[PDB]
Ligand binder design. Structure first.
Ligand SMILES: OC[C@H]1O[C@H](O[C@H]2[C@H](O)[C@@H](O)[C@@H](O)O[C@@H]2CO)[C@H](O)[C@@H](O)[C@@H]1O
Ligand SMILES: [Ca+2]
Ligand SMILES: [Ca+2]
Ligand SMILES: [Ca+2]
Ligand SMILES: [Ca+2]
Length: 450
């Protein structure tokens, strides 16, 4: 049966994906990095087959609720019960969900509880003074209550301690679920909101949809800090510790993969559900992984193939930011949120398709254990086993041809059939000699000798 461990997520910033209706292009200006660029819900529906053909099983949309001026990204909300006018209507969104569901795809909406836009009407309502915390900047970030009570980036910080605010938020959470039949929320700014709140929130949204999925963004690289939030009703967490290592290691050649395995081991140590961690090479808040490769003066296509190979073969829930599949460039926010281009070379689109198909086909890649057999200076072998399937993931992140011999770590008398690139390694006297040319990868299934 399908579980969230089995899912692959395609992550989209609505305004920056596909402008499928030019008639809602209000003040659009593609040459202003802080304007709306036109991407909308019709654009998303038009590309669902594109997304599915890459092997993606779910989509995550940045927030669709009406924003104030300047809020192209969706995080400066003006009305919690309205679809943003640039993106479409409520009916256009219900059709998106129906069309995703027709293709067996899940829909995750980005959901904000922490704050409103700078100019939300509530700020003028004398009866709403107590809906917001005192207007203060966050200074001591080691003070968790200051982090929870301060105005993040000057954004009006909602007071969940007020039961009217809490009820409003639960009410709206439940409404979108009941009205549009979405499958989950990606929860923004989870660490700026107190833990007791998430326990109650979780209980509310699953009371209306038993299997409703929550993915928490807890922006921190310490897994002990992040994992505490999984005890408060949030199913899955964004893996910033994975990201930190994967972005760095795969953006240049001749770098050790071992820190990624320690990320795993630490995930098993600290989290209740270590397969339910969202893994990624970049996102809408980081520099593009392509930019990291460019900065290192090295071919980004090659870097992405190795990184994506790891992403689609390691534990977790892969989350691929729109544009990864065309090596879309971009520096810091807002330059990491460039309009998508659908008319490029297809090399990475096809590669990603292969990887998504292999992750779907090979249950060891979704549910297997995860063992490190060998790692030296970027040359890595991993093993995964699920029931009677054994897979070996070989990533040569070195600038040399590498030969590694396994002798004991695999059952003798068999062969490793390469499913990514067609390699074949037969057991010779109980040994498997694995050869990979520089900056290549292969995913092998252990099978009878042919
Ligand atoms: O105006 C400040 C800031 O707000 C938004 O940032 C988001 C971020 O994208 C989320 O993933 C998360 O960390 O919460 C933030 C606040 O909701 C905009 O995305 C950003 O461009 C802007 O500077
Ligand atoms: Ca449009
Ligand atoms: Ca608006
Ligand atoms: Ca807060
Ligand atoms: Ca080693």
């Amino acid at each position: 049966e399908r579980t969230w461990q089995d899912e692959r997520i395609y992550f989209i910033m609505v305004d920056r994906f596909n402008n499928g209706n030019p008639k809602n292009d209000y003040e659009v200006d593609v040459h202003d990095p802080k304007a709306y660029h036109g991407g909308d819900l019709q654009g998303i529906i038009d590309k669902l087959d594109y997304i599915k053909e890459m092997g993606f099983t779910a989509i995550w949309l940045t927030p669709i609720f009406a924003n104030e001026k300047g809020g192209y990204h969706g995080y400066w909300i003006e009305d919690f019960y309205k679809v943003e006018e640039h993106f479409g209507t409520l009916d256009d969104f219900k059709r998106l969900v129906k069309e995703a569901h027709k293709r067996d795809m899940k829909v995750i909406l980005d959901f904000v509880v922490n704050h409103t836009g700078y100019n939300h009407p509530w700020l003028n309502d004398p009866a709403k003074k107590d809906w917001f915390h005192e207007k203060k900047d966050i200074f001591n970030w080691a003070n968790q209550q200051e982090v929870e009570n301060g105005w993040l980036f000057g954004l009006p910080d909602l007071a969940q301690e007020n039961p009217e605010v809490k009820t409003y938020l639960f009410d709206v959470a439940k409404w979108w679920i009941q009205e549009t039949d979405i499958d989950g929320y990606r929860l923004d700014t989870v660490k700026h909101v107190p833990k007791w709140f998430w326990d109650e929130f979780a209980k509310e949204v699953k009371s209306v949809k038993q299997d409703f999925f929550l993915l928490g963004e807890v922006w921190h690289d310490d897994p002990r800090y992040v994992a505490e939030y999984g005890k408060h009703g949030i199913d899955a967490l964004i893996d910033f510790p994975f990201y930190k290592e994967a972005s760095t290691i795969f953006s240049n050649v001749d770098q050790s993969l071992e820190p990624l395995y320690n990320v795993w081991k630490r995930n098993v140590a600290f989290y209740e559900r270590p397969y339910l961690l969202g893994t990624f090479l970049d996102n809408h808040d980081t520099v593009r992984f392509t930019r990291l490769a460019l900065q290192n003066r090295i071919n980004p296509v090659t870097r992405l193939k190795l990184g994506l190979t790891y992403l689609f073969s390691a534990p977790g829930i892969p989350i691929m930011y729109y544009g990864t599949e065309i090596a879309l460039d971009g520096g810091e926010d807002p330059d990491n949120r460039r309009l998508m281009n659908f008319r490029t070379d297809k090399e990475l689109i096809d590669y990603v398709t292969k990887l998504g198909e292999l992750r779907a086909k090979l249950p060891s890649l979704r549910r297997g254990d995860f063992e490190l057999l060998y790692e030296k200076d970027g040359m890595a072998l991993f093993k995964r086993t699920y029931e009677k399937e054994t897979t070996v993931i070989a990533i040569n992140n070195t600038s040399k041809t590498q030969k590694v011999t396994l002798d004991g770590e695999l059952e003798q008398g068999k062969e490793l059939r390469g499913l990514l690139a067609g390699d074949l390694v037969r057991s010779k006297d109980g040994k498997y000699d694995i050869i990979l040319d520089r900056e290549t990868a292969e995913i092998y299934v252990l099978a009878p000798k042919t």
